[PDB]
Amino acid sequence: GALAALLLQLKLELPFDRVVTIGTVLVPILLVTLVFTKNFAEEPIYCYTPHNFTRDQALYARGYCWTELRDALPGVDASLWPSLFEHKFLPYALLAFAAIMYVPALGWEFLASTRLTSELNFLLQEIDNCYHNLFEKYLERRGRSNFLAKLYLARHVLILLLSAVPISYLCTYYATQKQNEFTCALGASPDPAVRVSCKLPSVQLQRIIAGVDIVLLCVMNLIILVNLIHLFIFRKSNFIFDKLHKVGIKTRRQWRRSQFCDINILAMFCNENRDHIKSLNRLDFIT
Amino acid sequence: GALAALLLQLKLELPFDRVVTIGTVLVPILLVTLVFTKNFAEEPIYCYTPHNFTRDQALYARGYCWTELRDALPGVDASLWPSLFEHKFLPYALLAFAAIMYVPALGWEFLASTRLTSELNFLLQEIDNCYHNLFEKYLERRGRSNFLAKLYLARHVLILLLSAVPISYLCTYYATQKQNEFTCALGASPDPAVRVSCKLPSVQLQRIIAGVDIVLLCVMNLIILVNLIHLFIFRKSNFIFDKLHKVGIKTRRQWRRSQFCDINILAMFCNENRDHIKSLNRLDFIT
Amino acid sequence: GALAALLLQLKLELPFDRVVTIGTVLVPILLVTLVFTKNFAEEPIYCYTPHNFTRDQALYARGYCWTELRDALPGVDASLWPSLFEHKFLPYALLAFAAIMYVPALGWEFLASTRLTSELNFLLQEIDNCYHNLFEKYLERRGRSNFLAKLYLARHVLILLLSAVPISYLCTYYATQKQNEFTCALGASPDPAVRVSCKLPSVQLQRIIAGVDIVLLCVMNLIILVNLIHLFIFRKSNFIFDKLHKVGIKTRRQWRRSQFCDINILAMFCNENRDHIKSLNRLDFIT
Amino acid sequence: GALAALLLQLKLELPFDRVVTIGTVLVPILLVTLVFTKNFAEEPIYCYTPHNFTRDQALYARGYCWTELRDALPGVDASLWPSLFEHKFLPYALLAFAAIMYVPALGWEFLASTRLTSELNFLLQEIDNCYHNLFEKYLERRGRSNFLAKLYLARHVLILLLSAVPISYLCTYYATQKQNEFTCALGASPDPAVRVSCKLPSVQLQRIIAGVDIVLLCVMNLIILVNLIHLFIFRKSNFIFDKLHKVGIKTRRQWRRSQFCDINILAMFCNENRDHIKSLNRLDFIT
Amino acid sequence: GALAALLLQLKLELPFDRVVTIGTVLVPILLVTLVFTKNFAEEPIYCYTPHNFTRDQALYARGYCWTELRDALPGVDASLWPSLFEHKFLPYALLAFAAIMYVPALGWEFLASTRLTSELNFLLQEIDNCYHNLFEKYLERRGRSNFLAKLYLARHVLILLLSAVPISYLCTYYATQKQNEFTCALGASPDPAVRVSCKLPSVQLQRIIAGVDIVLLCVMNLIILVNLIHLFIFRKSNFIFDKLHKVGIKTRRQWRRSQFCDINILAMFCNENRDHIKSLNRLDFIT
Amino acid sequence: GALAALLLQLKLELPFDRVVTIGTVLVPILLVTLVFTKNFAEEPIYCYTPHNFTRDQALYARGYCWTELRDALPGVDASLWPSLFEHKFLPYALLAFAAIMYVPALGWEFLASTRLTSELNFLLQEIDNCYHNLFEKYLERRGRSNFLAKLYLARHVLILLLSAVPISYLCTYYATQKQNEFTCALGASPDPAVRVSCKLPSVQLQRIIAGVDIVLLCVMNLIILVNLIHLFIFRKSNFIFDKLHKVGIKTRRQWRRSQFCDINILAMFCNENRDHIKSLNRLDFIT
Amino acid sequence: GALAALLLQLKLELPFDRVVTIGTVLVPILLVTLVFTKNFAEEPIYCYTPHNFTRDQALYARGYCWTELRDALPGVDASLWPSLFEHKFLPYALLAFAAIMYVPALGWEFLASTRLTSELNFLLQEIDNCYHNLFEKYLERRGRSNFLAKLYLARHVLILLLSAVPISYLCTYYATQKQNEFTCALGASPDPAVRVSCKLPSVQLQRIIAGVDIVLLCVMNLIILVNLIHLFIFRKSNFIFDKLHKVGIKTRRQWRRSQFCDINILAMFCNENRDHIKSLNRLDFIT
């Protein structure tokens, strides 16, 4: 059994989950690191300075106007001056969104690690016996359990619910703030405050990234809905039933009565692991 | 036994412990490293300088006002000037809190490494024999021991007690330190001391981090309490008893008389390692 | 079976796919990283400054004229001033093009991982028996399937369709914009706006890279078309039929009627994996 | 014996030694590296400069006042000026203290590597035989050797003696130096020496580190003393004697006549390696 | 067969190919990286500046005269001003020329990875049979094939053809351009253009590297020609025919008629893998 | 023999050699790297500059006074001016001393790699036979060879001889070079040479390192001498003779007639590898 | 044969070759990297500057005088001005010398890889048979081959011939150029050329390195000559003949007639691989 031992690793992750993970979590991290690399290659703020100022006072003006980040208008008190804090706060939101989106994929394993592996191992061992009524009675008990169905459905729906947060915040940022210049007003005269106008060269790129992320995240939300409806309603085929050719009449009406059956979920992992069963081709040609 | 030897590793850590560790220790390290990366990308302090000063005197003024970090008020002596030391000392507190929270996880292993492994190995070896009165007398002696219960309870209750320190310090920091500008007063005239006002651009981000960490640490404190009560009081089921179908009358009343039973802790570990026993499915279908 | 177990890995990617991948995806990444390395070794913009300006105002002028990146002309309002944004936006387009071109290679595996491996394993196991009528009837069912053919054609035809985007954008950039100098006009006089003329030293190299990429990507588009026509139309030879020497007359007219047959794709993989069969040389010399 | 060969690594380090090492050696290295990281993020010394000085003379003044590091007072000659050298020399003392504390742990292995392993292997091999008078006479000779006891006691007592150096120096430093400003007086007039006052921004953090290390190192000194007395005086139980159930009366008097017995040290090692013996549970239930 | 399995790797690359690769491809990469390391340790251009210029105008002058890289002469219009472009472009051309020459090594592997290693196993296996007429007729069919000869010849001749590009370009660069100074003329007067003379300190080292690479690449071109003629024409010896001692007269005339035989190429590979056959020494001493 | 194969590694290095290596070679490398890290964290030389000097002339003065490193005195010609080259040349001396001290340890292996291993393997194989007159006559021939003794003695004495160089140079450096200030005199007047006084802030730490290294290297010299005398003169016990209990009278008087015996060296190696013989404990209890 | 398979690696490199390589090739690389590390930690050239020069012209002057690197003298035209190019060109010469010296060691393997291993394996296999006339006649044929002798001599003599280049260039550099100052004369007056005096602080260390390399390389040249004469002329002993005790009278005078025997080279290799033969000690004691 050296060959079996060397290839004893069993796939426990459907390709659809991998596609969803790649399309949802991995790409935003790459975009965030690209934005960070671009942002740490230039000075943060560029703006003007009167003639009388020395170098140190100019440095203080730049630092203060970057730290405060508050606009000003003529004839209006400071109680109504607009702010631009999210222009500086944006990337950390995406950094947190990556993890909050990744949580469910890690959550599923802690519940599906062992039981599914044991059941799959037992079924694959049993397939050898049927090549030539312990198994017949097993389907009756196993086919009325709906624990796996009640868990697989829960994982997918939670992704849809958690997707309302990132889209809502990005949608209200893309079409709300377009300002790029403001009149910073530092108040101090330790020899009538002076006024400067400053520019933010960190906005023409973050605008584009916030637009691509909306489209990419919305497509993944739609593709989940179409697969879920088709899977549990329209599909009336089971892989295990086709390759067995010996099923009792007592299991006929049960299968088309309710689709919330354990054997429905178990049918996929056997299909995706058809390599490990060596009697598939020989048995298929018999019929 | 090549297949068994290749997979001879036995799980020893419960999933709940892993969840608690991830939710308690790992995240604050990431937040601290993010804060450090942000903080080491700018100057420490920006502030003003009179016209007569040269460059070196301005540099000395900046350094002295950063090092002293003391406020000033008119008409008040130096004996009552407020300080702002937390704004400089904050991150190391979190750095120490990470380790002081991580200690119990290391402490558990040094006491539970070997005995639990040996007992589990003996039990899993015995399960083969019961498929077809050493075990009958074994439960009488083993069921009256309470060493594991007296240790598992101690590990969880210690986390709750140690959680009073980090929360108490962070709560009083959130609602007390709100100042951002002060009038530093350096006293020296080696040709009536001059006065400058300085700004700290390292406070608008540390405020937010100190708020998220409170909520995250408080939720994990509550989730521990609910699980402890349910496991040791309300749950009246043992995994080993259900899959054996052979229990003496004498051991029946001892099970519900007290809950501090050694078999109770052993029951959970066997459930999470049900893969290693190959007679589970065959024996379950018998009943 | 230690020797077989050690060399249990089976080749799954055809050499043509590897050649296409190397010629399409890998090289643009190297060109992009070379461009980035060259571009991050100098200042972004070089230009002039009047005599009255101090240092800080000159720095502000440089930064503002780099950020705006807008031309100016005499006697024309600002509503018709040309822009040069792609000179700054170019490399990220190639960075995205690399991945959007690489997608189909990753897409192929998720569908061709298991079934092809199982079929190849069964055929290689069986080929020992033919050395000395399940196989005779096997070609009847297998030879009328066309799933693999309907998938292999889809992968190649999708590369050609996706090649219209990168070619169109690069073609309209190489021979449209050749400007290198412009008269930036910053408007502010907080003591009649001053005017400066600036130079972009990041255009003489990106022009050459955009030319080589056009030729390299166009050649791979042509080489795919010639191979597709030859493989499915002109080639009238099958590897298995040549080395079997026992085929019924029923499979003769079927093979010469339609080329959209499943064994045609399976023939190539067996030929490239002729090492794993040890009866090839002995059987070939028999005829 | 593949399973035995794969797990042939026998534990040789007691958990108490690991706890002492972690509590004594590892933590000071982390504190030292934290101090170094903090210290290499700022200029070494900040201080003032008269108006007539140019830039180069100011740089020389800073460097000279940092290098000399000597105080000054009015009306007192240079023969009585206080110094502050250890403020600069502190971290290397801790760096050396780490290694000088770590020496004994490395020293013990070179003497305890082989003999203990050989005797433990012999005992573990023999335990199989006793399941069903070489061993009876073996304890007579082995029980009268005190080499291991004479070595284990020496290792622990040496740690206590070596702990007088690091505590004495740190304790006498925490409460002798609170100065932070001094009046550096550089003497040179290459056109009545000028005087400047300088500040050291590397003292408010090294004070706290030198306080924590005192408490942490002192607690580990106390915990060693309590364990040594309990193990060699109060404890009147041997693991090997309890699990044998076949012992002679001749060894009874020698058991509590003297505690410097070889089997006493071997008793702990067998207890912590109870996994490697498979007859423990079966033999224990017999009594 | 553990010893055979452990040493199952078969050499499939003649030493001559390794020598050619090392002498042709590897060295230019080292020279290019040395040139890059030297060139990225100094400023690109040094030159003069009039007295009235400030710092920013001098920086613009340096940058503009580096970017334009155009000479100037008195009394001649700008349409005939000589250029010095390739002084900035040489290293990238060297990298491209070092990377292009790697195609044949990859092509040979792609075209002969499998067939040679599949065919050689039969010859290595049959040695046991010949120790004590399948092989007699085997050489008749195998000795009349010329596919391998038609491929080995193509690989070597293709190296010679692609070697005419690097030699032609480097030869016309070593003895054409020796200029080192020029009179850059920037035209702009935002208050009769000023004139400066600039120096390129990146030409005295690239001259030497372009000379060594000519000699090294030319020698490898000659050594290939002499080996090709000797192997296919003058050499009248076959390794297999010397170690078999049983060949028919039919195979005699054909071997000396045409040298374009598959057995000729297979002779060298068997000679370099004489270790894997253990009957060589015993059979050799028989004759 | 899987267990023997897994642990087939035989120790071929006495612990004393490891202790000497750690105490002699490893520590100076750590001290040198610490000195280098300290030395590359500050400017090399600090000193004064007259008022009329500009920045570039001050930089030239610093560079010249650092390069020349020559003192000056009033009324004395340049032929008698003292030098201070050691303060700049010191670390490379230690860097070379490390290797010149490490040479013998590498040298011994090239001569003791194979013969000792083979003879030890033969002896360990033989020990099995003696459990139940080839060996009786073996000691007669083996006991009259002194090759191993003539080599082990030579390795240790060469260490003592090579220790005269590093100690002699360091001792004369500690008590001779104490200067820290000098009056550099650069001679040039391209408008009576000016004079400056410079300070070297790289001497207060290299003095302490040169003191610790003297004590550490001297103690290791003494510990070698005491062990050499004890091993070859006072010790009158052999491990192989004690555990054999069967030696002829002919081998008795030759044992203490001369101590330059091969079995004397082999006695130590067998003792350190007592684990590999499993009959030690059983045979020892027999007597 | 698991033990033999695990230790199937046969030594092929003689210790003398390893000593020559480590003494010739490895050390110069370390010296070159030390020189590079020293040279890349300071400014390249320190040079003076008149009072009227601005900052940018001073920056130009240093670079121009460093690039030209040409001396000047009064009353002599530029046609006879000495140069100092090797002061800048030195390290690359050593970098190339390392590789040109390393070539032969890599060259020898491509010719000695296979046949030596095959012959050694056959002989070691044969040694088993002689423990109890194919081998008798083998020495007659093998003893008259001189291919290995004609190759081993060629490898060593080529090292001596290639040693004439590095020594000749270094000897003519140590005692030819000792200049350290020169009067650079930049000619340009774009408002009678000015003159400055420069300095090269990269000469006092390259002088010492060029002195050590002469001695180290010359000693290794002498040690090769003495070993070559002793091995092939004076030594009249063969290891294989001593341990066989069975040589014909025909084989006696041939060995003492000519020393260019293939068995002579093979004898040394067997001596260093005496571990792999287990009958060495048993056979040696027989005589």
DSSP F11-45: --S-HHHHHHHIIIIIHHHHHHHHHHHHHTTS-S-
Determine which of D60, D110, D140 to mutate to test the interface with F (most F C-beta atoms within 10 Å): D60
Longest CA–CA span in chain C (Å) reads 102
C-alpha–C-alpha distance, residues G123 and G244, integer Å: 12
CA angle G193, G198, G204 (to 5 degrees): 160
Give me the total of CB pairs closer than 8 Å, taking one residue from chain C and one from chain E: 67
C-alpha–C-alpha distance, residues C122 and C116, integer Å: 10
Please give the backbone phi and psi of residue E49, each rounded to the nearest 5 degrees, phi first.
-155, 135
Sign of CA dihedral D187, D192, D194, D197: positive
C-alpha–C-alpha distance, residues A110 and A114, integer Å: 9
G199/F63 touch (CB, cutoff 8 Å), yes or no? yes
Asked if F31 and F95 count as a contact pair (C-beta separation under 8 A), the reply is no
Longest CA–CA span in chain G (Å) reads 102
Q: How far is E79 from chain C (nearest CA, A)?
A: 18
Asked if B117 and D277 count as a contact pair (C-beta separation under 8 A), the reply is no
Asked if B119 and B184 count as a contact pair (C-beta separation under 8 A), the reply is no
C-alpha–C-alpha distance, residues F144 and F258, integer Å: 10
CB-count burial class (<10 Å; 0-12, 13-18, 19+) for F32: buried
C-alpha–C-alpha distance, residues C25 and G186, integer Å: 52
Chain C hits for A53, Cβ within 8 Å: 56
Chain D hits for B55, Cβ within 8 Å: 55
Residue whose tokens read 């050291």: D200
Residue D184's H or E segment, with its range, is strand D181-184
Three-state DSSP class for B180?
Answer: coil
CB-count burial class (<10 Å; 0-12, 13-18, 19+) for B93: middle
Three-state DSSP class for E276?
Answer: helix
**What letter would DSSP give residue G254?**
H
C-alpha–C-alpha distance, residues F270 and F263, integer Å: 10
Determine which of C56, C59, C67 to mutate to test the interface with A (most A C-beta atoms within 10 Å): C56
Chains E and G touch (3+ CB pairs under 8 A): yes
C-alpha–C-alpha distance, residues A100 and A24, integer Å: 11
Q: How far is G150 from chain F (nearest CA, A)?
A: 27
Asked if C73 and C182 count as a contact pair (C-beta separation under 8 A), the reply is no
Chains touching chain F through at least 3 C-beta pairs below 8 angstroms are D, G
Asked if B262 and B149 count as a contact pair (C-beta separation under 8 A), the reply is yes
Chain A hits for C9, Cβ within 8 Å: none
C195/E190 touch (CB, cutoff 8 Å), yes or no? yes
A110/B18 touch (CB, cutoff 8 Å), yes or no? yes
C-alpha–C-alpha distance, residues G220 and G213, integer Å: 11
Resolution in A: 3.9
Longest CA–CA span in chain B (Å) reads 102
**Which technique?**
cryo-EM
- No. of helices (H) and no. of strands (E), chain E: 16, 3
Provide the 10 A C-beta neighbour count for residue G49: 22
Alpha-carbon distances of C17 from B65, C109, C155, rounded to whole Å:
66, 12, 10
Determine which of B281, B282, B286, B287 to mutate to test the interface with A (most A C-beta atoms within 10 Å): B281
Token couple for D148: 């291991």
Please give the backbone phi and psi of residue G183, each rounded to the nearest 5 degrees, phi first.
-105, 90
Phi-psi region of F216 (alpha: psi -120 to 50; beta: other; left: phi over 0): alpha
Provide the 10 A C-beta neighbour count for residue F3: 12
CB-count burial class (<10 Å; 0-12, 13-18, 19+) for C135: middle
Q: Which residues contact G47 (CB under 8 A, 6 or more apart)?
A: F60, G61, G62, G65, G184, G196, G197, G198, G199
Q: Mark out the alpha helices in chain A (DSSP H runs).
A: 2-6, 15-21, 27-39, 55-68, 85-112, 115-129, 134-142, 147-162, 164-174, 206-229, 239-242, 252-257, 262-272, 280-286
Give me the total of CB pairs closer than 8 Å, taking one residue from chain B and one from chain D: 68
Rg (CA), chain C: 30
* Nearest CA-CA partner of D143 in D262, D30, D245: D262
Token couple for A259: 């689709």
Q: Which residues contact C121 (CB under 8 A, 6 or more apart)?
A: A275, C10
Asked if A14 and A272 count as a contact pair (C-beta separation under 8 A), the reply is yes
Residues of C with CB under 8 A from a CB of A: 1-2, 4-5, 8, 40, 44, 54-57, 59-60, 63-64, 66-67, 92, 95, 110, 114-115, 117-119, 121-122, 134, 137-138, 141, 188, 190-191
Token couple for C106: 């990753």
Question: Which amino acid type is present at position E239?
Answer: F
Residues of C with CB under 8 A from a CB of E: 2-3, 6-7, 15, 18-19, 34, 41, 43, 46-51, 53, 55, 58, 195-197, 199, 201, 204, 272-275, 278, 280-282, 285
Residue C102's H or E segment, with its range, is helix C86-112
Of E43, E49, E195, the CB nearest to G57: E49
Contacts 24+ apart (CB under 8 A), E236-241: E238/E263, E238/E264, E238/E267, E239/E267, E239/E268, E239/E270, E239/E271, E240/E123, E240/E266, E240/E267, E240/E270
C-alpha–C-alpha distance, residues D101 and D141, integer Å: 36
Question: Which amino acid type is present at position C222?
Answer: L
C-alpha–C-alpha distance, residues E31 and E94, integer Å: 9
Chain C hits for A19, Cβ within 8 Å: 110
Of E3, E43, E272, the CB nearest to G1: E3
Q: Which residues contact E122 (CB under 8 A, 6 or more apart)?
A: C281
A57/B47 touch (CB, cutoff 8 Å), yes or no? no
Chain F hits for D60, Cβ within 8 Å: 46-49
Q: How far is D203 from chain B (nearest CA, A)?
A: 10
Alpha carbon D109 to its chain's center: 16
Residue A196's H or E segment, with its range, is strand A196-199
C-alpha–C-alpha distance, residues E76 and E69, integer Å: 17
Q: Which residues contact F123 (CB under 8 A, 6 or more apart)?
A: F266, F270
Q: How far is A201 from chain B (nearest CA, A)?
A: 17
C-alpha–C-alpha distance, residues D70 and D78, integer Å: 9
Chain A hits for B7, Cβ within 8 Å: 8
Question: Which amino acid type is present at position B86?
Answer: E
The tally of CA atoms less than 13 A away on the side-chain side of residue D48 is: 20
Provide the 10 A C-beta neighbour count for residue B266: 20
* Nearest CA-CA partner of A227 in A14, A10, A26, A13: A14
Please give the backbone phi and psi of residue D58, each rounded to the nearest 5 degrees, phi first.
-65, -40
Q: Mark out the alpha helices in D85-163 (DSSP H runs).
A: 85-112, 115-129, 134-142, 147-162
Alpha-carbon distances of D34 from D30, D39, D209, D212, rounded to whole Å:
6, 9, 10, 14
Chain G hits for F57, Cβ within 8 Å: 48-49
C-alpha–C-alpha distance, residues G83 and G182, integer Å: 10
Q: How far is E231 from chain C (nearest CA, A)?
A: 28
B54/D50 touch (CB, cutoff 8 Å), yes or no? no
Residue of C nearest to A2 (CA): C5
Residue whose tokens read 């452990």: E6
* Nearest CA-CA partner of D45 in D25, D65, D28: D65
Q: Which residues contact E44 (CB under 8 A, 6 or more apart)?
A: E66, E202
Edge-to-edge strands, sheet with F181-184: F46-47, F196-199, F181-184
Token couple for F270: 């067998």
Q: How far is C229 from chain A (nearest CA, A)?
A: 32
Asked if E175 and E287 count as a contact pair (C-beta separation under 8 A), the reply is no
C-alpha–C-alpha distance, residues C244 and C284, integer Å: 9
Three-state DSSP class for G104?
Answer: helix
Question: Which amino acid type is present at position E167?
Answer: I
Residue of F nearest to G272 (CA): F114
D285/B54 touch (CB, cutoff 8 Å), yes or no? no
**Breaks in chain A after (C-N > 2.5 angstroms):** 132, 191
Of A50, A199, A280, the CB nearest to C67: A199
How many residues are present in chain G?
A: 287
Span between the terminal Cα atoms of chain E, in Å: 30
Asked if F272 and D114 count as a contact pair (C-beta separation under 8 A), the reply is yes
CB-count burial class (<10 Å; 0-12, 13-18, 19+) for B87: middle
Alpha-carbon distances of B181 from B177, B199, C55, C237, E67, rounded to whole Å:
12, 5, 29, 85, 47
